[PDB]
Ligand binder design. Structure first.
Ligand SMILES: Nc1ncnc2c1ncn2[C@@H]1O[C@H](COP(=O)(O)CP(=O)(O)OP(=O)(O)O)[C@@H](O)[C@H]1O
Ligand SMILES: [Mn+2]
Ligand SMILES: [Mn+2]
Ligand code: NA
Length: 359
């Protein structure tokens, strides 16, 4: 019996149901754009459970006993079994609002509100947006347009590893005892990603040393001429506050959203070609040493795995979980963890490996 929770499922990158899940992911994305949160959630949960299957669905009988598959979802599956296509997802892919939203938000610095604004102004192409003499762009959007081709091309594993070397070299220069971990999609085993994320923590650093590290590391890269974009968000972390009750929990740790210049010579791949460097989106998070397991768990993802982990903790265990802590409402105590395994054990869950969290 397959659980309704992604945190009680093993979801690996060998997806046998991409025909169904690609269609469900498109329908969920459209519901997000149309502000239909409920329908979005139902399609995301259906897509997630099909991603966990160890075999491809080839008939409607194969869907028996699978949770999170409502009547609307089963109609979509039936249509794909019929002729190998989803008429519903095909209509979304041909919709002008959907096409514009996907295209505009593919730019770093452009979200739902700016994409909607440009659509209602009559824009349909990035060429017309960039060349417009009346539009005003944020510093984030300027970087998004300037490095667009590099950012839209996938970051591969040799590039992610080359970035990891740069991050570690910079970090240990100021904090030699610091632990640097690659998180996000690449930690879940992905071959490619839109960015490279890292968790940084130090067992001996002070509160001030912890606060200054991201400033020191980015100033060092600025001096090197490697910092193409930088936004540092100061910490709002509260050591003794209860974890978030929200569906999508906010992270209060100090973090930075960067664009780094990655020289081709630093990349050890099978394959200078052009300008000799590639712009790479990099996110760095700094957390207190005692919260490193909660931060690692939250930053590893996937987003669906994190949502279900927090939902299971609340509804099944009367626990409150987020990127900073785990609180037991029955025992009235915060639960400590030195590893992700200890968090799973506190929750009464079998340990799910990072490459099994692709929900
Ligand atoms: N810029 C950011 N802001 C907030 N959280 C982020 C973040 N980047 C990464 N994370 C966190 O770490 C996980 C990775 O998030 P994302 O970076 O948005 C992409 P991904 O799941 O890593 O695959 P991809 O970036 O390789 O395509 C998420 O669970 C999220 O909570
Ligand atoms: Mn990522
Ligand atoms: Mn990221
Ligand atoms: Na965007």
């Amino acid at each position: 019996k397959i659980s309704q929770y992604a945190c009680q499922r093993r979801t690996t990158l060998n997806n046998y149901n991409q025909l169904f899940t690609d269609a469900l992911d498109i329908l969920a994305e459209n519901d997000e754009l149309r502000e239909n949160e409920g329908s979005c959630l139902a399609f995301m949960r259906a897509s997630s459970v099909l991603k966990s299957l160890p075999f491809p669905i080839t008939s409607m009988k194969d869907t028996e006993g699978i949770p999170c598959l409502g009547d609307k979802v089963k109609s979509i599956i039936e249509g794909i079994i019929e002729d190998g296509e989803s008429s519903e997802a095909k209509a979304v892919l041909n919709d002008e609002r959907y096409k514009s939203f996907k295209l505009f938000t593919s730019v770093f610095g452009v979200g739902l509100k700016t994409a909607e604004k440009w659509f209602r102004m009559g824009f349909r192409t990035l060429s017309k947006i960039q060349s417009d003499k009346s539009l005003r762009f944020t510093q984030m959007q300027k970087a998004g347009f300037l490095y667009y081709e590099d950012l839209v091309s996938c970051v591969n594993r040799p590039e992610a590893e080359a970035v990891s070397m740069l991050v570690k070299e910079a970090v240990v220069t100021f904090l030699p005892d610091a632990l640097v971990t690659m998180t996000g999609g690449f930690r879940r085993g992905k071959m490619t990603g839109h960015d490279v994320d890292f968790l940084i923590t130090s067992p001996e650093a002070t509160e001030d040393e912890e606060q200054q590290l991201l400033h020191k590391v980015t100033d060092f890269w600025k001096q090197q001429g490697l910092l193409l974009y930088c936004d540092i968000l100061e910490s709002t972390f509260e050591k003794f506050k209860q974890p978030s009750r929200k569906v999508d929990a906010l992270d209060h740790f100090q973090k930075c959203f960067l664009i780094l210049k990655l020289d081709h010579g630093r990349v050890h791949s099978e394959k200078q070609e052009g300008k000799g460097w590639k712009a790479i989106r990099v996110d760095l998070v700094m957390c207190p040493y005692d919260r490193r397991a909660f931060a690692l768990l939250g930053w590893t993802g996937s987003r669906q795995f994190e949502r279900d982990l927090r939902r299971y903790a609340t509804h099944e265990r009367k626990m409150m979980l987020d990127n900073h802590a785990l609180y037991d409402r029955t025992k009235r105590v915060f639960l400590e963890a030195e590893s992700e395994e200890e968090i799973f054990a506190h929750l009464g869950l079998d340990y799910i490996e990072p490459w099994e969290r692709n929900a």
